[PDB]
């Protein structure tokens, strides 16, 4: 019957003999308990306060079947190479979650548990999303295959430039830079993540002039061109108003900042994109606030899975070699989780769980930030074809300007593709391939000379 009062969470929420169901959501938590708190009790608190339980016994439990609703820690993995850490594996029944709601899934699993007094730190490392739950989500509006078919672009990574300076340019000046980047050989240009609508440049003026720039550059080059028009907005109504105008202008692609806008707005937009044949580029602004430190937060691989479910056609994945952090092992893992249909468990690449995506479309990887022509062989080798390589300063910072800047990057990419398709080792012959192509391309030669000495080499925080 009903026994009032406090008892240990582990009595109900630690179940080492439980075998997970194929319908269960699985979570891998890196847990750092306070001194004197047993691993089993910490793991059980996490399981409890992210599912059904609270700090004291409630009678209302007996109205229902707590045993079939509760989350449970079914495995504990000590991490002897770490200071007072372990991995808690937690299973959550399918029935706990709202169909098609990334928002609900995160509210349960990461809602309250990270601030628990009895923990020093907590990090969500991975989630196993069951096939039965995945089927309740749209996923990407289009995905890699459909995007390539819509754009008629095959056999190589796609290329983009971010317009700079980040803020301060007029709408007319913005469109001018777009036309020049695109005509020079880039497939895409883009709004900076923080270009929405501002006193120096209102969104509707920007959208209009960018559309003019695309039409001119597309007609001149004979290649399909795009610009990720940023629809990130104060409200859902304003977000959709901007997306609708891009549609009215027959723009092929828009962008959205999924974390700063949020998953509810993003899921709305992803559905709108599917309904309207609009490609959706996703910027991951704010991710490093949550995902950088090993001891606490949410790993990007989880945020990436959540984005694939909510929906996006492209997502930023880091560069490895550029100005922003991205460990190679960690990156290759979550790149696979974003693009592939079936990913086998692999702890060497941070893949805690085998993930079956049940034919949910894959997301294009986007490598952006502090990269230039010298990085091209490494970028091609790391990411492969199904990626977009973006050069902001690496284009607009070219000695001769935008159009040459674009041509420099386009030549550099196509040379790296040809060389790879000839059987050459891009990691060995990297510098040689760039130097070979520089002879034919004065644009490339000038780009190479300017950025020869520029490397970003620091110790990564987010590592295996």
């Amino acid at each position: 019957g009903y026994q009032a009062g406090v008892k240990d969470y582990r009595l109900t929420y630690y179940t080492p003999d439980y075998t997970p169901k194929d319908t269960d959501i699985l979570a891998a938590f890196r847990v750092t308990p306070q001194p004197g708190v047993p691993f089993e009790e910490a793991a059980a608190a996490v399981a409890a306060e992210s599912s059904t339980g609270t700090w004291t016994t409630v009678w209302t439990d007996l109205l229902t079947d707590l045993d079939r609703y509760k989350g449970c820690c079914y495995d504990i993995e000590p991490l002897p190479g770490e200071d007072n850490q372990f991995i808690a594996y937690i299973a959550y029944p399918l029935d706990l979650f709202e169909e098609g709601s990334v928002t609900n899934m995160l509210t349960s699993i990461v809602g309250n548990v990270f601030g628990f007094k009895a923990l020093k730190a907590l990090r969500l490392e991975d989630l196993r999303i069951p096939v039965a739950y995945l089927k309740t989500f749209q996923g990407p509006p289009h995905g890699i295959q459909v995007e390539r078919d819509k754009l008629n672009k095959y056999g190589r990574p796609l290329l983009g430039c971010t317009i700079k300076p980040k803020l301060g340019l007029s709408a007319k000046n913005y469109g001018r830079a777009v036309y020049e980047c695109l005509r020079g050989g880039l497939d895409f240009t883009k709004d900076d993540e923080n270009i929405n609508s501002q006193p120096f440049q209102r969104w509707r003026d920007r959208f209009l002039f960018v559309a003019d720039a695309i039409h001119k550059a597309q007609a001149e080059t004979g290649e399909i061109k795009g610009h990720y028009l940023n629809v990130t907005a104060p409200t859902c109504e304003e977000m959709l108003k901007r997306a609708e105008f891009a549609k009215e202008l027959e723009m092929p692609i828009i962008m959205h900042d999924f974390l700063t806008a949020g998953f509810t707005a993003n899921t709305t937009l992803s559905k709108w994109c599917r309904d309207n044949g609009m490609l959706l580029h996703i910027h991951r602004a704010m991710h490093a606030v949550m995902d950088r430190q090993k001891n606490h937060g949410i790993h990007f691989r989880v945020l990436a899975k959540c984005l694939r479910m909510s929906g996006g056609d492209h997502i930023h994945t880091g560069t490895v070699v550029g100005k922003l952090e991205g460990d190679k092992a960690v990156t290759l893992g979550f790149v696979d989780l974003l693009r592939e249909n079936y990913i086998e468990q692999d702890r060497s690449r941070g893949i805690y769980f085998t993930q079956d995506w049940a034919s949910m479309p894959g997301v294009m990887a986007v490598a952006s930030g502090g990269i230039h022509v010298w990085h091209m062989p490494a970028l091609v080798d790391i990411f492969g074809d199904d990626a977009v390589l973006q050069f902001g300063g690496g284009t607009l910072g070219h000695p001769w300007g935008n159009a040459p800047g674009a041509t420099a990057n386009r030549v550099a990419l196509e040379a790296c593709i040809q060389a790879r398709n000839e059987g050459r080792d891009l990691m060995r012959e990297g510098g040689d391939i760039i130097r070979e192509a520089a002879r034919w391309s004065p644009e490339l030669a000038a780009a190479c000379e300017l950025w020869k000495e520029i490397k970003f080499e620091f110790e990564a925080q987010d590592t295996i």
Binding site: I144, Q145, R148, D149, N152, K153, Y154, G155, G185, Q218, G222, E223, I224, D385, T407, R410, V411, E414, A415, Q418, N421, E422, G423, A437, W440
Partner: protein, 93 residues
Amino acid sequence: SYLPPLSDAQIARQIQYAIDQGYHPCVEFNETSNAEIRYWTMWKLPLFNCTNAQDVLNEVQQCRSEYPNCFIRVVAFDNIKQCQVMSFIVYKP
């Protein structure tokens, strides 16, 4: 198209790479090479199970003789992923 025009040895080397990966080559042609043109006209059928890159080049030559006023390109596709994995123009009229 941003590189110097390819030689026959370079073209055959690109085609062989596709074959080695298990991709299926196909030849198509059109009056314009503009990317806004969604569909090109297929030459015969895709060359399923061609292990020789020369056999692909042979179909290009036969297509060129019948249609000298048309652009010709070679494409390869992955049937498992069902996607086109390469495309490059081999002849400009």
